Amino acid sequence: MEEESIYNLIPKEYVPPPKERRYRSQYPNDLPPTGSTFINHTTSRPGVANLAGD
Amino acid sequence: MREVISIHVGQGGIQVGNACWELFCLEHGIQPDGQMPSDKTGDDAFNTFFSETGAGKHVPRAVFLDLEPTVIDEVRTGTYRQLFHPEQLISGKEDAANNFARGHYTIGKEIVDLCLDRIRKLADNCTGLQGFLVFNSVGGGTGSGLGSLLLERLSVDYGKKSKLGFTIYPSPQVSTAVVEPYNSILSTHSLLEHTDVAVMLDNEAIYDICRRNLDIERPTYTNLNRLIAQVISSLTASLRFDGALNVDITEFQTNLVPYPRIHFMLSSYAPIISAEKAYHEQLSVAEITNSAFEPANMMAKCDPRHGKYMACSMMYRGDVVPKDVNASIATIKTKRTIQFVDWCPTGFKVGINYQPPTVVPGGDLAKVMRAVCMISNSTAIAEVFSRLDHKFDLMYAKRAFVHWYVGEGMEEGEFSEAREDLAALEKDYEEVGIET
Amino acid sequence: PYNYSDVFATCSTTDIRVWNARNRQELLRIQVPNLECYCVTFMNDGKSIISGWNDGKIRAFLPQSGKLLYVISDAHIHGVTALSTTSDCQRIVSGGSEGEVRVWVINKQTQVMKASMKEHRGRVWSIQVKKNNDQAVSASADGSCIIWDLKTFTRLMCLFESTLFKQVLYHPEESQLLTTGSDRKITYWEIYDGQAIRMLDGSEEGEVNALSITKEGEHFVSGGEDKLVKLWGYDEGIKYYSGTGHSGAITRLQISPDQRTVVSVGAEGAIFIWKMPEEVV
Amino acid sequence: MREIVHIQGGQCGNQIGAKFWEVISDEHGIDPTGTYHGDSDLQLERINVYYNEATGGRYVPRAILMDLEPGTMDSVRAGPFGQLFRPDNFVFGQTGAGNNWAKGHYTEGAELIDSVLDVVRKEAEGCDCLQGFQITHSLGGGTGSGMGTLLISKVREEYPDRIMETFSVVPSPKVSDTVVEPYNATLSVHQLVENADECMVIDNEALYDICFRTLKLTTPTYGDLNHLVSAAMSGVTCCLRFPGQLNSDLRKLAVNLIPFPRLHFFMIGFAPLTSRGSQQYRALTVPELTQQMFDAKNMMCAADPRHGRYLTASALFRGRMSTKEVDEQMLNVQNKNSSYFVEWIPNNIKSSICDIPPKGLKMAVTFVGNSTAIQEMFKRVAEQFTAMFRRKAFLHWYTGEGMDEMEFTEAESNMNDLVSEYQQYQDATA
Amino acid sequence: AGPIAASCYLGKDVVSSAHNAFIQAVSDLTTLGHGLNIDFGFVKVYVQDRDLRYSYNQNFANTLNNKNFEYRLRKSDTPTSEHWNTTYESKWAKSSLNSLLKRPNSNQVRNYYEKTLALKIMSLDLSTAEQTNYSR
Amino acid sequence: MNLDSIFEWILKQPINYPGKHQDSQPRTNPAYKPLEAKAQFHIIFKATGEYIREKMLDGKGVNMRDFGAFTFEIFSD
Ligand SMILES: Nc1nc2c(ncn2[C@@H]2O[C@H](COP(=O)(O)OP(=O)(O)OP(=O)(O)O)[C@@H](O)[C@H]2O)c(=O)[nH]1
């Protein structure tokens, strides 16, 4: 149930939480896959990638 | 009295559903006609996947959806034409053409109604329905759009019924299209709050596995589909075969997902050896479980060594023994290069099943008396989200290709909320990964 | 409104309006076809607004929506003139044109009257009730400021001065009464007929009409029939600043409860809001 | 299903369509009598895309031939496979344009075009579900460059949602057979950039060069040029007609290939093309196909793609091949040539597979590439345009029947702005 | 319709649409009666029930017989030099067209435009003064 | 019909004759205020009527594309 009051006039303006942080990421953009076999063409890399997770 | 319903959308979804339904049929001994294996001769296990028609043949509890008719035409012309019900292979007229907006707002809404009608017509038959499996290539317009639409529609039509999404995210550097970052991000924004369990199925890792192990230097999609089908069978054998320690579909969301926002896992399968040397090593439980945890054997192109582990669920099928399994678990725990998160003292769930893995004629794997399938939730999967985020922002800096989605009924802002949701997911993951 | 300055209400020749202090656009109106209201008063805790009209009827309207909550019929012969609400708001006091003061016990179920129907030959113009709500002072048109016990409806000791009186008011936390009248003079009075200072706030023909005070009796603002309005220091009767530029006879001047401003209402349709001086806080 | 209709106008368009229909009929196994003589079911699985069925079991192409002179169609009807075309589809004028864009776009063509637009609307209404419209024409001739583009505008403004592409033959100044190429070329481009959803440019100079250098055959001919361009044309829609690992129709190609609305001018390539002496020597593999595909000389345009940076590329493979090696080759080519690929669009190569190769070949490759090297065509066209325009040469022929210099000035300014906006994106960096 | 659109400062597409809409007078004509008396200047053309007739301005006709058209009929009257010397702006300035409508004051038009725009965009409130000028 | 009754007749039914003429259109020159749909249509016709007269003043004759054609005859001598 609602009661009509003078104080109820001028409804409150809406205040949301303004913004969230755009990002947080601690991994590099370029991270070579561990066991990839797609880069070793024309290069002496025993047919496997770094494989050490570097 | 337990059934699961399969949903296959997208070209990749169809091409993997065909492979998995070959495997299920071979497992249950059904012929392509759908009957018993001719007149040469009923354990009642097929009820998990199949349903008896009342006179003879079996109809699978699966539905295929597509907007481009092609694959539906070939599956209706092939040898399994009489197997599937004529009116569960839903075909559209115009494809979305790698456009997520087209498949989510423009043309998929006219087909989703027929799909829901068919899903109801299949669900009312079942009485002890465990849940739904869904397959969709996420890097495609119609696949992503219909996958989304079906997920939110089912979430409100059924509610608490469990759904498992086996999606194929694009590789870090190898890709076929040029616009898939947009639709992949939008689809992830869709599925994050709607999918109970999601599993990584990136293609680069499977290519590498096939190259290193199967010694196949010219592999195609069929081998990848066969491997994925083997994973499916190893996961779902527990419901239809007797075992010492059984695990149901409901015994996943209670053991593998520590918090509701964290429900993405990555898989591994062992052993994966070509038959030319397959049994020239003993294939013991210890070595197969070590190969399962080997970082080079991940089904997705992610390195778990960069992060911690929260959950590991392993299903052994074949000739395993609980004492040997526990002895292997002890060694894995003692190994130093693999570290678990602090607030999880024990993180292993183990299931045992006695049905040995099968070989499919024309296959590549060898039929072995022991195999293990591993699904892990670990913190290292943030890297793929980070690199896709960088790829997406590289595109969106200059608002390229945005018109192709703006002109298809969806407004400008939806990219912002998807990016924010990805950021929030990264926040949650890296907050959970920190020790107390 | 009591202890509230964000909104303020004005009665008209036909219709009540409400206004916002920060921005002066209309917020709401109550419309009556061919009647005029006197002494519209807010009642605390958001209850209905009360007005008395020409025909003698009293009407109460809800704040949010323009629907009447109740009506008092045949309250006074020629129209209610002054209204005052007690703090606990079970009773309303009203004044008629033909010299009467009446008390009505409002109640959510019913409206009842228990006035002694006192005699007062002049029409009222201002009725006040002190803080403890026990005592009620009423000003006459014929020259008497009568104080009422309001408990036994008796003790006719009334202040004597020969003019057409105007607004009266209690001093904040005191027994002193500040009153104005047709004579161009502001007169302090006491319960013992004591007159501390006797102002003579005289224009040529400018009859001081309205008065308002601070919560602490530092100064009081006075508005006359002339166009100019001024505020006097209470302790000593010396002008501090002045207010002009109005057209016609300013009739009422109120001070917001927060006292950041003063509003004044002009007989020809003009509303003036005044930025109060800084060094009165 | 998802069928398209063909419309060709002018002598050049008629010659291109004559060979293209021969090629497609040969690939589908259709005899010159319209009788089915194929060997597999797949030759009838998706025959509706181009052929309509008639009583008696015969087929008719859904192509509309238009011209202002009857000689070209009178000559082509007598050629092989000439009886397939429905005679009602031929619409012809009795005056001709004389290589004047004003004649071929304003006076006689507009009163002719009612019948051809009406037959086009019957053709579109009859078929179940449209996919789009395809046009072949040359910009060096007045009548073709006028009716072609005006019909483009009409059909686009009538079916705004269906896809629309044109094979445009642009006049190279080295081999120019008329004196009025720049005028009508610029005028046609002015509205072609406005209406054409997709435009693919072909150069006679480049055709001569590739025929002499790659095939090394003594006597090039317009028949050989038509054969090459027809193979290129069929390579685009092969996957729409046949199964494959990853089908990609014209809509998917357009979505994946244009980053912005006003860059829809493309350059195309075909592989393999092996010399006479070396058909027995060369080995058909994916690496060989890719290295010939990315060769500058294999191009059918005189623009050198190494003068600019590739916005994007798209490749249609035909034949049976595992997608892993294809993806490997595309990635290797992209990594080895970082200088020629603009950086803010990483992984800008689209790949698609169709498992049915051309008849007589085991593998084939069709290429379409959006790159900044095409700007020099427009630059040289504008150069000759202003060189012949500053003296107001031959302007009376145009101005005598509706033209004012304001239209020419506006077209020049619009094409110059097109060049400028095409060239800033080359220098754009992230 | 390009010169007409330029003279009216209107769109080429909209002026073409206006022509295409108006040329649909045959629909009105097919209905019984409805005689069309359309003028638009020198030619006065009348359409009865199904009968059509026309008239021309007598002065305009006399201008045609003013026998000076021997130069206009031939294309070789010009010395063929001024085709590139004379600019179209100069030719269009002396052309009869563009003189139908008066040219307003360019300064005045946007002065009024932005002036009224500011006035109305911030004419919302009249109460605020902040600068009184009591005495004057 | 007086060339204006046609104006109101065509403006009366928009469904029968939908087009850009039915509503006002912005000009290319901002210095000019917009016209009404009916007024701009009359202005367009006045402009065309003058265009045809100044073209007919030369040896060149003008035609409407679906409504007649303005020509002249030369008997010669
Ligand atoms: N693992 C795997 N992925 C596939 C296969 N086929 C297609 N894909 C993936 O699907 C992506 C493109 O989507 P498609 O499956 O071809 O088609 P779609 O999902 O229906 O979406 P559209 O192309 O818009 O029609 C490709 O980038 C592939 O990565 C497959 O057989 N196996």
Ligand SMILES: Nc1nc2c(ncn2[C@@H]2O[C@H](COP(=O)(O)OP(=O)(O)O)[C@@H](O)[C@H]2O)c(=O)[nH]1
């Ligand atoms: N590929 C090809 N090009 C042609 C053919 N005939 C003419 N052309 C080219 O088209 C240009 C002239 O086009 P034109 O005949 O005037 O076009 P039309 O006016 O529409 O008939 C020349 O520069 C030729 O190079 C042909 O049969 N095949």
Ligand SMILES: [Mg+2]
């Ligand atoms: Mg697809």
